[PDB]
Amino acid sequence: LPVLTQPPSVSVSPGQTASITCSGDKLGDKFTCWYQQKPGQSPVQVIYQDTHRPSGIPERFSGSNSGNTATLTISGTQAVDEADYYCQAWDSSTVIFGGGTKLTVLGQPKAAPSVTLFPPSSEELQANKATLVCLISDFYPGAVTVAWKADSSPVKAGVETTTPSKQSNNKYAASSYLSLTPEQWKSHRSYSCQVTHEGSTVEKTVAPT
Amino acid sequence: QVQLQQSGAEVKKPGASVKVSCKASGYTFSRYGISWVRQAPGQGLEWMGWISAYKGNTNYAQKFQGRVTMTTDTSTSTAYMELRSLRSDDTAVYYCARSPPDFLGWFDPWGQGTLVTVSSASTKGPSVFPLAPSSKSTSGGTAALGCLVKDYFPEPVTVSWNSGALTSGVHTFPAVLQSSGLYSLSSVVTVPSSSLGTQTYICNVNHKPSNTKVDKKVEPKS
Amino acid sequence: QCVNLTTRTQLPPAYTNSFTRGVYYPDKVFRSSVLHSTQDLFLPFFSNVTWFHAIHVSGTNGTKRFDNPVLPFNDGVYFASTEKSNIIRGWIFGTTLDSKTQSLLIVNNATNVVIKVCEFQFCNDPFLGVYYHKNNKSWMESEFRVYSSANNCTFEYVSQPFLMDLEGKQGNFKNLREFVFKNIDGYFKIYSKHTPINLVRDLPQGFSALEPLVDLPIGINITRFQTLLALHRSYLTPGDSSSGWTAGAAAYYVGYLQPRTFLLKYNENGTITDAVDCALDPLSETKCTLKSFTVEKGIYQTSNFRVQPTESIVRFPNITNLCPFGEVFNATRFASVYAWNRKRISNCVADYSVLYNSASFSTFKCYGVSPTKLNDLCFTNVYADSFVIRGDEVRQIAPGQTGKIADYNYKLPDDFTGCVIAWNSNNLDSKV
Ligand SMILES: *[C@@H]1O[C@H](CO)[C@@H](O[C@@H]2O[C@H](CO)[C@@H](O)[C@H](O)[C@H]2NC(C)=O)[C@H](O)[C@H]1NC(C)=O
Ligand SMILES: *[C@@H]1O[C@H](CO)[C@@H](O[C@@H]2O[C@H](CO)[C@@H](O)[C@H](O)[C@H]2NC(C)=O)[C@H](O)[C@H]1NC(C)=O
Ligand SMILES: *[C@@H]1O[C@H](CO)[C@@H](O[C@@H]2O[C@H](CO)[C@@H](O)[C@H](O)[C@H]2NC(C)=O)[C@H](O)[C@H]1NC(C)=O
Ligand SMILES: *[C@@H]1O[C@H](CO)[C@@H](O[C@@H]2O[C@H](CO)[C@@H](O)[C@H](O)[C@H]2NC(C)=O)[C@H](O)[C@H]1NC(C)=O
Ligand SMILES: *[C@@H]1O[C@H](CO)[C@@H](O)[C@H](O)[C@H]1NC(C)=O
Ligand SMILES: *[C@@H]1O[C@H](CO)[C@@H](O)[C@H](O)[C@H]1NC(C)=O
Ligand SMILES: *[C@@H]1O[C@H](CO)[C@@H](O)[C@H](O)[C@H]1NC(C)=O
Ligand SMILES: *[C@@H]1O[C@H](CO)[C@@H](O)[C@H](O)[C@H]1NC(C)=O
């Protein structure tokens, strides 16, 4: 699998040009299509075969494909061009779809994701189980991601992550849970939840007692 | 003018088989192809496979090889896809796109998609723990405490603070759906660090499909 | 799976002049500077070779004018093409180009040639669909754009390709390819030649013989043929229609063979370097009569002139006694079956046609001689026997039967020669 790597979020102020890069291996002997999916609808094809655009798509979407990256470019980004954009590569045998890219027409000031971390309560310790609780809030551009840490290493098992949800103030919130047996809870001297958001990162940490 | 109408919002159990239909109108059905695309809720698109409407001629992905069967019916001009041996991880939205009769591209019109949900929990009451205010949650003038209400199926559940008294800092986070099939959530509120144990902070948990009502006090760690 | 491609073009095909082209070695027998005259199917010199414009492109938004007709195959064809591309693949030969008749298919791809005699189901506009890989390498070539089904498959052959590209070509030169097809005595013979030429509008002025390629032992009845062209898939549209296939420019030359006499001048290595076609003009008939390429002054007897006669006038004498059969076939009272009559018809003019076509006879069988050839033969005597029998006893009046009639009433010898005539007579002979 030549699997295409594509960034999770691109933030653009109203009136600028957005550039989405679908980079996968090879990708020069394959044609690439670009699809647009608004939230709650079926996707819409916006670029079919390597800079070719169908009728009905306005004259600001332009594709490109050269080397090991494909590129979608929107010029003069309005508020209606806010959706998910998928990159797709086909050959004689199979078809690969890339990851998403949520584009956002910054209608406000980049907020800071307030993070808050909680260790497993005492009753849960007596309950022969353990759960770490990482809450994220107020981070208006919603492309947050999370990573979990035992004393020095990253962990990738026992964690669940909510998709971002819009609050009343029209910013976002999210949550993640870490499953642990209490003996593993006291095994490692401390854990932490880190969140990355627009390159920036903030992490919080808790140690057992 | 062209049109792909899908069918159903099926709910199955783990182990059963599902059949989705996609009916075309507005063009000559016999000279094109149909491809199927999956999308898990909150994830990206996956390619399932492709069929040509001329004479059979399937092409499946290797992840779904041996599980899916796609057929056509040009007399009524519909297309069917059948998945077998369903499990959790297969609950998704299934899309039907009009591809060419050859060369495996061009997912243009995208019929509206059917949501297929697998599972089986019925109903269950919540388990509650208090997440104590701690110095790791404390910072300067304020410190946060909350209540974790987990493992329940019947989605509408509510947690209030002090019978509805505190509205400052009280924030209930969206419930999360685990692999076990049960929901879970945690509601937290910040309160001045001078007031760790001083006043009353009791979370009132009410589960309306069931009849669960429990008040849990949150106090600083021992 | 096949496409309507044919756009109606008002323009007719042009005509060029085959100066001296399409000559081949009609046999495997090394010669060395021997001036040899041969009567065979050749293309006549300075004949009228049709220039077919196939796919051709005009630039307004890009319009291809597809017109690829089915042509007759009279006695063999001379085919010629100056194509830089690889747009001319093989041919289809046959009688109906359909089911219920066998057909022959020659296909050249980039590494082999494949020849099938089979029972095809060709479409109205057959072509070869080619697919590529975005690095312009080949992916697949579907022959299901030619036919829809191919069953009952008799002959198959596969070898090194007939036609190759050889691009580059020393800067600015063109590669003329010539083929001669002829199907005689159950064999299908193909002759070929490749020659480099410069930028000429037509066939060149030189001389080049054609070496034989294959002699396929088929036994196929061929009266029509058609040319296969290769089209590439466009990938800029999902549909399979005429907008979904791209094409270059294609043109070829077609002339027909005729039985002529050619004087061939061999080389010392075994190479036909020049030739001349007898007939045509007088000078050439003299060169053929002398067996030379230079005639010295003189006067030479070259042939003969014989007026031709039309129609055949057959004169003869009138007619009197055209036989009045109207006594034996028109009697008021016949004769019993146990004492039949016996009339000995004699010298006269007998017209068995008035009998044969009278349509009043329920049975008219002839044994020694079929009926229509009676009015063209002469004998010594005709006898006519007459009687009356039941209706279902007429099958015993025949050579070699049994029954109460043929046993002892009237017996016919076993090498009978005449004819037996019988008709119903219920109203005359049966009475209440
Ligand atoms: C060119 O033609 C030859 C002759 O048919 C093709 O070779 C055959 O390919 C098929 C599969 O495509 C095999 O099953 C046969 O065994 C092959 N026969 C021989 C004699 O090689 C060849 O694939 C064609 N090439 C292209 C690019 O179409
Ligand atoms: C190949 O040709 C043979 C005859 O040459 C076909 O056989 C005939 O089939 C029809 C119906 O299928 C019968 O009514 C005839 O009696 C058959 N002929 C004889 C001589 O028995 C055969 O069908 C052809 N092959 C295919 C695939 O159609
Ligand atoms: C080869 O096929 C052709 C078919 O055209 C035969 O030629 C005659 O074609 C006309 C046109 O349809 C028919 O009306 C005649 O009946 C055909 N002739 C005969 C004798 O049937 C031609 O005869 C065929 N050759 C052989 C050897 O069978
Ligand atoms: C016997 O004589 C009759 C009468 O002369 C012939 O009948 C004629 O047959 C022709 C052709 O069928 C009819 O056009 C006439 O109309 C018939 N005659 C009459 C008077 O109508 C009959 O052909 C004779 N039989 C033979 C064997 O010559
Ligand atoms: C064009 O194709 C259609 C089927 O696609 C067919 O019905 C029609 O007869 C074709 N046109 C001609 C002139 O044969
Ligand atoms: C070839 O035929 C066309 C008409 O069919 C005629 O005009 C032309 O003169 C002919 N060519 C020769 C060389 O006779
Ligand atoms: C492939 O060929 C087409 C047409 O001949 C040309 O436009 C294209 O640039 C070629 N691509 C490569 C990679 O050579
Ligand atoms: C062919 O003939 C030419 C002269 O016409 C001679 O020079 C040459 O040696 C011969 N043999 C070959 C080419 O093998």
Author numbering:
A (entry chain L): 1 to 209
B (entry chain H): 1 to 222
C (entry chain A): 14 to 445
Q: What do the authors of the reporting publication say about this deposited model?
A:
The SARS‐CoV‐2 spike protein is critical in the entry and fusion process, which is initiated by its interaction with human angiotensin‐converting enzyme 2 (hACE2). The N‐terminal domain (NTD) of the spike is an alternative target for neutralization. The surface of the SARS‐CoV‐2 spike monomer displays 22 asparagine (Asn)‐linked glycans, with 8 located in the NTD. To characterize the epitopes of mAbs 3711 and 26434, we solved the Cryo‐EM structures of 3711 and 26,434 in complex with the SARS‐CoV‐2 (WT) spike‐ECD to determine their overall conformations.
In contrast, antibody 26,434, encoded by IGHV1‐18 and IGLV3‐1, with a moderately long CDRH3 of 13 amino acids, binds both the NTD protein and the spike monomer protein. Biolayer interferometry (BLI) revealed that antibodies 3711 and 26,434 bind to the SARS‐CoV‐2 WT spike trimer protein with affinities of 48 and 670 nM, respectively. 11 To further characterize the silent face‐targeted mAb 3711, we also solved the cryo‐EM structure of mAb 26434. This antibody binds to the spike in both RBD “up” and “down” states and exhibits a binding pattern similar to previously reported supersite antibodies. Antibody HCDR2, HCDR3, LCDR1, LCDR2, and LCDR3 were found to be involved in 26434‐NTD recognition. Antigen‐binding specificity analysis indicated that antibody 26,434 loses its binding capacity to Delta (B.1.617.2) and Omicron (B.1.1.529) NTD proteins, whereas antibody 3711 retains potent binding to Omicron NTD protein, with partially reduced binding to Delta NTD protein. In contrast, mAb 26,434 failed to neutralize the Beta, Eta, Delta, and Omicron BA.1.1 strains. Consistent with in vitro results, supersite antibodies 26434 and 4–8 showed reduced neutralization efficacy against Beta, Delta, and Omicron BA.1.1 variants. mAb P008_056 provided significant protection against Beta variant infection but not against Delta or Omicron BA.1.1 infections, whereas mAbs 3711 and 5–7 protected against Beta and Omicron BA.1.1 variants.
